[PDB]
């Protein structure tokens, strides 16, 4: 569980989205596991606009923040689940670090702000859905 609150937008994992999220839908992409819905209250998360490859992510399964090195956003294959069939997820960044079911939604941050959210994991690895290319989140 977890979301990004920037201006009048809420950013969540698409597979974790609520009824409210779908009834107030702005944009969604299954191939990125992202969904953006509208909000009445104003959010103050700063989204990073950079090509950083080091940052810090929140791991709810350990109740701890962890520093990580992470790869450039790319098309990576992701095994089947009760939410999606086997497929390549786009805009995904990998890091060596702990994650287990229940960790999706944890924020990855760099010195410039929010980079993305936990979206995949397993085998001593963690995957993040990048949000830095979504320039419209700020306007
Ligand atoms: N983006 C997807 O299609 C996800 C959907 C949920 C499930 N997805 C996973 O990665 C599986 C899983 C979840 C987690 C996460 F929550 F950190 F992701 C950690 C580990 C694992 C593991 F190791 F058991 F396979 C794909
Ligand atoms: Zn940065």
Compute, in angstroms, the gap from residue 93 CA to the centroid of ligand 2: 14
How far, in Å, CA of 64 to CA of 98, rounded? 10
Q: Is 118 in the pocket of ligand 1 (CB under 6 A)?
A: yes
Nearest to 65 by CA among 109, 13, 96, 11: 109
How far, in Å, CA of 75 to CA of 3, rounded? 22
Q: Is 37 in the pocket of ligand 1 (CB under 6 A)?
A: no
Strand-strand pairing, 74-78 and 107-110 = unpaired
Whether 52 has a binding-site annotation, put simply, is yes
66 Cβ neighbours under 8 A, 6+ residues apart: 56, 57, 59, 97, 98
Declared resolution, Å: 1.8
65 flagged as catalytic: no
Compute, in angstroms, the gap from residue 100 CA to the centroid of ligand 1: 7
Please name every residue paired with 126 in a beta bridge, in sequence order, or none if there are none. 95, 121
- Specify the DSSP class assigned to residue 112: T
How far, in Å, CA of 80 to CA of 84, rounded? 6
Q: Whose CA is nearest to atom 9 of ligand 1?
A: 120
Q: Where are the domains of the chain?
A: 3-44, 45-139
DSSP H/E element including 18:
none
59 flagged as catalytic: no
Q: What is the biggest distance separating any 2 CA atoms in the chain, rounded to whole angstroms?
A: 40
The experimental technique behind this entry is: X-ray
104 flagged as catalytic: yes
């Amino acid at each position: 569980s977890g979301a990004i609150y920037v201006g009048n937008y809420r950013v969540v994992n698409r597979h974790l989205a609520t009824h409210n999220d779908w009834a107030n839908l702005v944009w969604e992409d299954s191939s990125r596991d992202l969904l953006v819905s509208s909000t009445t209250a104003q959010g103050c998360d700063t989204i990073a606009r950079c090509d950083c490859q080091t940052g810090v992510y929140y791991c709810s399964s350990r109740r701890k923040h962890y520093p990580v090195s992470f790869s450039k956003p790319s098309l990576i294959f992701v095994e089947a689940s009760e939410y999606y069939p086997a497929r390549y997820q786009s805009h995904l960044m990998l890091a060596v670090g702990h994650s287990e079911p229940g960790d999706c939604g944890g924020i990855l941050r760099c010195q410039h702000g929010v980079v993305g959210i936990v979206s995949t994991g397993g085998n001593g690895l963690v995957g993040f859905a990048d949000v830095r290319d979504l320039l419209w989140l700020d306007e």
